[PDB]
Write an enzyme that holds these catalytic residues in place. Structure first.
Site, short mmCIF file in Angstrom:
data_model
loop_
_atom_site.label_atom_id
_atom_site.label_comp_id
_atom_site.label_asym_id
_atom_site.label_seq_id
_atom_site.Cartn_x
_atom_site.Cartn_y
_atom_site.Cartn_z
N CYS A 109 41.43 26.66 37.84
CA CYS A 109 41.58 26.44 39.28
C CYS A 109 42.76 25.53 39.57
CB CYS A 109 40.31 25.81 39.88
SG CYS A 109 40.60 25.49 41.63
N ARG A 112 42.27 22.09 42.41
CA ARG A 112 41.30 21.03 42.20
C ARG A 112 41.70 19.68 42.77
NH1 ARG A 112 40.54 21.35 35.98
NH2 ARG A 112 42.62 22.34 36.02
N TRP A 281 40.10 27.98 50.04
CA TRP A 281 41.04 28.77 50.82
C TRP A 281 42.01 29.41 49.85
CZ3 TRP A 281 40.47 23.51 51.93
CH2 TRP A 281 41.37 22.66 51.26
N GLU A 286 47.49 35.10 45.79
CA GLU A 286 46.31 35.90 45.49
C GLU A 286 46.26 37.15 46.36
OE1 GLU A 286 42.58 33.60 45.11
OE2 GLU A 286 43.80 31.94 45.90
C1 HEM Z 1 40.26 24.46 48.06
C2 HEM Z 1 41.21 25.37 47.82
C3 HEM Z 1 41.25 26.21 46.52
C4 HEM Z 1 42.33 26.85 46.07
C5 HEM Z 1 43.73 26.89 46.74
C6 HEM Z 1 41.98 27.50 44.82
C7 HEM Z 1 42.81 28.27 44.05
C8 HEM Z 1 42.43 28.99 42.95
C9 HEM Z 1 43.13 30.11 42.35
C10 HEM Z 1 44.45 30.72 42.85
C11 HEM Z 1 42.41 30.51 41.30
C12 HEM Z 1 42.77 31.70 40.40
C13 HEM Z 1 41.71 32.72 40.80
C14 HEM Z 1 42.24 34.12 40.70
O1 HEM Z 1 43.44 34.28 40.35
O2 HEM Z 1 41.44 35.05 40.99
C15 HEM Z 1 41.23 29.68 41.20
C16 HEM Z 1 40.22 29.74 40.25
C17 HEM Z 1 39.00 29.12 40.28
N1 HEM Z 1 38.54 28.25 41.26
FE1 HEM Z 1 39.75 27.41 42.66
N2 HEM Z 1 40.64 27.25 44.55
C18 HEM Z 1 40.15 26.44 45.57
C19 HEM Z 1 38.85 25.98 45.67
C20 HEM Z 1 37.84 26.08 44.75
C21 HEM Z 1 36.47 25.59 44.91
C22 HEM Z 1 36.01 24.88 46.18
C23 HEM Z 1 35.79 25.87 43.76
C24 HEM Z 1 34.33 25.59 43.33
C25 HEM Z 1 33.48 24.87 44.07
C26 HEM Z 1 36.72 26.55 42.90
C27 HEM Z 1 36.45 27.02 41.63
C28 HEM Z 1 37.26 27.85 40.91
C29 HEM Z 1 36.91 28.51 39.68
C30 HEM Z 1 35.58 28.35 38.92
C31 HEM Z 1 37.96 29.25 39.29
C32 HEM Z 1 38.00 30.12 38.00
C33 HEM Z 1 37.23 31.42 38.23
C34 HEM Z 1 37.58 32.46 37.20
O3 HEM Z 1 37.77 32.11 36.01
O4 HEM Z 1 37.66 33.66 37.59
N3 HEM Z 1 37.94 26.66 43.53
N4 HEM Z 1 41.30 28.76 42.21
N1 LIG Z 2 38.04 43.33 37.16
C1 LIG Z 2 39.12 42.85 36.71
N2 LIG Z 2 39.08 41.76 35.94
C2 LIG Z 2 38.77 40.54 36.45
C3 LIG Z 2 39.65 39.91 37.32
C4 LIG Z 2 39.35 38.66 37.85
C5 LIG Z 2 38.16 38.03 37.49
C6 LIG Z 2 37.84 36.67 38.07
C7 LIG Z 2 38.37 36.58 39.50
N3 LIG Z 2 38.09 35.25 40.07
C8 LIG Z 2 38.02 35.36 41.54
C9 LIG Z 2 38.37 34.03 42.15
C10 LIG Z 2 37.82 32.91 41.54
C11 LIG Z 2 38.08 31.65 42.06
C12 LIG Z 2 38.92 31.52 43.14
C13 LIG Z 2 39.48 32.62 43.78
N4 LIG Z 2 40.29 32.44 44.87
C14 LIG Z 2 40.13 31.45 45.77
N5 LIG Z 2 41.13 31.06 46.45
C15 LIG Z 2 38.80 30.77 45.96
C16 LIG Z 2 37.52 31.25 45.97
C17 LIG Z 2 36.71 30.14 46.13
C18 LIG Z 2 37.49 29.00 46.21
O1 LIG Z 2 38.81 29.41 46.09
C19 LIG Z 2 39.20 33.90 43.27
C20 LIG Z 2 37.28 38.65 36.61
C21 LIG Z 2 37.58 39.91 36.09
C22 LIG Z 2 40.43 43.49 37.04
C23 LIG Z 2 41.67 43.00 37.42
C24 LIG Z 2 42.49 44.10 37.58
C25 LIG Z 2 41.75 45.24 37.30
O2 LIG Z 2 40.46 44.86 36.96
#
Ligand code: HEM
Ligand SMILES: N=C(Nc1ccc(CCNCc2cccc(NC(=N)c3ccco3)c2)cc1)c1ccco1
Ligand code: HEM
Ligand SMILES: N=C(Nc1ccc(CCNCc2cccc(NC(=N)c3ccco3)c2)cc1)c1ccco1
Ligand SMILES: C[C@H](O)[C@H](O)[C@H]1CNc2nc(N)[nH]c(=O)c2N1
Ligand SMILES: C[C@H](O)[C@H](O)[C@H]1CNc2nc(N)[nH]c(=O)c2N1
Ligand SMILES: [Zn+2]
Lengths: 411, 411
Positions: A109, A112, A281, A286
């Site tokens: 993330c 953070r 947000w 993304e």
């Molecule tokens: C507040 C603004 C936030 C921004 C700008 C942000 C941004 C991001 C981005 C760009 C990713 C990559 C996710 C992806 O590419 O699909 C990510 C991952 C993640 N975020 Fe943050 N996030 C925010 C808030 C939060 C909050 C509030 C939480 C939990 C309470 C959180 C937990 C996580 C987790 C667990 C991941 C990893 C999930 C995974 O491995 O797929 N995020 N974040």
């Molecule tokens: N299924 C696929 N793989 C795959 C891809 C991605 C994942 C994990 C995706 N985490 C989604 C994710 C997680 C955390 C934050 C955001 N965003 C935010 N801002 C946000 C949300 C809350 C606070 O902040 C998005 C798991 C499996 C794939 C990709 C292409 C074809 O297939």
């Protein structure tokens, strides 16, 4: 036992001792690095108490009463309840601590720096899918805040036996539907094609268009999931325009303001929360990069390049890159002009470096996953590309979990 | 014992057994991943024979006479020479095999689809810095081939004792000089400021401009290094223009066509080649993104955005990204219009996926470093972003080595 991470753009060097507290394993060995593997891989009462003790020791240490009277009482209190009940229950303050630190410890993330500004909604009193719907609507309304987005998590009851599990079947509370056509191709969002069809299998009536907000599929206490449609007035949307190219409106694109993942699993003190939708947000990329321009997603580089008058013949004309930047200027511009919270990959990544500093100072480290922290465009022009990062697994934590339709016993 | 790597854009899955042969360590443990640490960290005759045996077993296996007569003879032959001399000497064919496989095994190299088309120059008969200069000029002339660049490596004598070491002190055979000013700022290339000053300390006379090709500092058999100026007719340069923006010529930028690293160390069968300059050709982004737009490099995003008429006030206007794509269109366009070999990050990364397939089929794997394979711009619009990669260390290999001025005994 005290590792060094360097920034190769500022020559700043930071020392990591936090990784010491690490415990979980990473997938890597001394002879293989899995730092680019996407997903690397009931619980007894024996295992549960060290995990509770561990957690409680950091919680009381964090309010500056470690090992004290009120600590050892709660340590004993949880010990006794784990003997008795074979599990236990977190104080409201302990749940809010755990949740915020699960986010603090999310090494993928980049957001953070905000980890301490997180609104925790305790839905541990929930018993039915309708209650889940109601808690989730309130989460969506609160976190959206009319576009001045606020970070929030709603935590449904912990797993107990395992056959009683609360689950949001959606991967995010707000997602666009995906439908495959007769000619194979996909309308809407290809990522969600199977889920969109699960909703139809359980009863959804699809407006088979593009940006159709899916319904919620909510499973309560192990029972089969039920469909609910978020009141559209609660689903804030930004129609995407470009600040120079008036044909951009003709593309007719929009995205929801609220990213809220709901398919993940929150671990706090050994307890497992299988339904814990969290929202913050969007960083622009993304949407503009991955959502819009992934090949197996909306895949709009074709049309945007066309309307831009671009040399699409040769790969090396960087027409793909050229259209990619315009799409992301449009995403950011649109969101900000609507007073909907969004961050750009430059502000967000500088903030993460700034966040990384604070963590190494007042915590001795910051677990970070470079593969995921570096934005999906313009890698090296952002400060995180040049920042060495140590990835390690700290708890409390957010964990991947199976899709509930692969694991569930229906009827 | 048979790991799986997945492409998440094509759903293609490949199975890795090559990592089994791995031996060297990665820096990562089960509890910490160092996949984003930039550099992770005399030899006796005991250690030398397994390494020679290991190498010779794969070499004869590769010509389809493993364990045969001619094999066991050479195994014995090298065994005897390691007893006698405490070291040994590679056959010409063994040197060419080793070198090409050192490149094949370079997990950070996105260019390896070409690994078998490598011209090996045996300079193991060299004794003086002038001979090194002469071998290097011939390398530069051959590899450049009038802009139809050819891959090549020149291998100077192996390390023996350690106080007799052949070294090219330059980090690349062709590099632009860097001079700091009175007002602190930097003319030319900031990366090379210290080396540019080492050349002056040993005698260089600097044309204190921008794209001044540094001289070679060549150390032979441990002796103090000596300066030589590559004949300018051997140093091919591409002046950078843009295929739409005629003010781009006014920027007055150019880059050398020939990327040839010379500061690395080639390991073959336990033998160590401390001077082994290898060249191939540039992927556009190394110049357009890193060379030109790194902050501690030419850092030209300022001026290019200006001339483009750009909203430089707000970070979120993606003006930095917008200027970054134009700079790379110009690099590619310029090089191709001059019939100088260059590859774009889209062709190169698709080729690497194609290369990865062949390796997993006819070799059981391909060590790859995602952190370095993904190009520094437009990450996710290239197929390598979505490709899971296993990083592990195979031998023969190219290794980092100390800068020779930190380790050398002068006089
Ligand atoms: C507040 C603004 C936030 C921004 C700008 C942000 C941004 C991001 C981005 C760009 C990713 C990559 C996710 C992806 O590419 O699909 C990510 C991952 C993640 N975020 Fe943050 N996030 C925010 C808030 C939060 C909050 C509030 C939480 C939990 C309470 C959180 C937990 C996580 C987790 C667990 C991941 C990893 C999930 C995974 O491995 O797929 N995020 N974040
Ligand atoms: N299924 C696929 N793989 C795959 C891809 C991605 C994942 C994990 C995706 N985490 C989604 C994710 C997680 C955390 C934050 C955001 N965003 C935010 N801002 C946000 C949300 C809350 C606070 O902040 C998005 C798991 C499996 C794939 C990709 C292409 C074809 O297939
Ligand atoms: C033929 C065309 C080639 C292309 C397009 C190419 C491309 C690249 C690129 C872009 C990198 C990243 C380097 C950086 O970002 O600074 C790299 C790394 C590397 N390349 Fe290749 N390369 C080519 C040929 C070769 C050859 C011929 C060799 C050896 C004989 C080689 C060995 C290496 C090594 C060892 C690295 C890693 C060095 C390090 O860790 O700093 N490459 N390559
Ligand atoms: N000094 C720094 N760190 C640092 C940065 C980079 C390195 C290793 C660089 N490998 C350079 C390199 C290596 C291999 C290939 C190329 N290219 C080619 N096409 C090519 C050459 C031959 C065949 O193909 C370039 C080591 C240390 C730094 C960065 C910013 C501020 O400081
Ligand atoms: C194969 C690779 O692990 C995969 O593409 C990862 C790379 N980095 C990522 N980073 C973010 N932020 N989001 C992602 O989905 C991915 N995908
Ligand atoms: C800190 C980080 O390891 C560093 O920026 C790496 C990342 N990936 C890279 N990839 C390439 N190709 N070249 C580089 O110099 C780097 N630098
Ligand atoms: Zn690792």
């Amino acid at each position: 036992r005290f590792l060094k991470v360097k920034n190769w753009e500022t020559d700043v060097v930071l020392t990591d001792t936090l990784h010491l507290k690490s415990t979980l394993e990473t997938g890597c060995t001394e002879h293989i690095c899995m730092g680019s593997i996407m997903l690397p891989s009931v619980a007894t009462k024996d295992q549960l108490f060290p995990l509770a003790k561990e957690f409680l020791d950091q919680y009381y240490s964090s309010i500056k009463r470690f090992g004290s009277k009120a600590h050892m009482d709660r340590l004993e209190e949880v010990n006794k309840e784990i003997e008795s009940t074979s599990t236990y229950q977190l104080k409201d303050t302990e749940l809010i601590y755990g949740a915020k630190h699960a986010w603090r410890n999310a090494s993928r993330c980049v957001g953070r720096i905000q980890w301490s500004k997180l609104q925790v909604f305790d839905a541990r009193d929930c018993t039915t899918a309708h209650g889940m719907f109601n808690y989730i609507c309130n989460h969506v309304k609160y976190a959206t805040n009319k576009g001045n987005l606020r970070s929030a998590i709603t935590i449904f009851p912990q797993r107990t036996d395992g056959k009683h599990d609360f689950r949001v079947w959606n991967s995010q509370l707000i997602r666009y539907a995906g439908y495959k056509q007769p000619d194979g191709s996909t309308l809407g969002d290809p990522a969600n094609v199977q889920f969109t069809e699960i909703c139809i299998q359980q009863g959804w009536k699809a407006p088979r268009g593009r940006f159709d907000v899916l319904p919620l599929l909510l499973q309560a206490n192990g029972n089969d999931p039920e469909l609910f449609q978020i009141p559209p007035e609660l689903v804030l949307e930004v129609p995407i325009r470009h600040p120079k190219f008036d044909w951009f409106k003709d593309l007719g694109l929009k995205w929801y303001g609220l990213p809220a993942v709901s398919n993940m699993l929150l671990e706090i003190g050994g307890l497992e929360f299988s339904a814990c939708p969290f929202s913050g947000w969007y960083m622009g990329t993304e949407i503009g990069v991955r959502d819009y321009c992934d090949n197996s997603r909306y895949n709009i580089l074709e049309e945007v390049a066309k309307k831009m008058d671009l040399d699409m013949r040769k790969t090396s004309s960087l027409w793909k890159d050229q259209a990619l930047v315009e799409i992301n200027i449009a995403v950011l511009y649109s969101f900000q002009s609507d007073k909907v919270t969004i961050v750009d990959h430059h502000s967000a990544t500088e903030s993460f470096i700034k966040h990384m500093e604070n963590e190494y100072r007042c915590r001795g480290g910051c677990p970070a996953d470079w593969v995921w922290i570096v934005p999906p465009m313009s890698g090296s022009i952002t400060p995180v590309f040049h920042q060495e990062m140590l990835n390690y697994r700290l708890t409390p934590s957010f964990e991947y979990q199976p899709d509930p339709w692969n694991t569930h016993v229906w009827k």
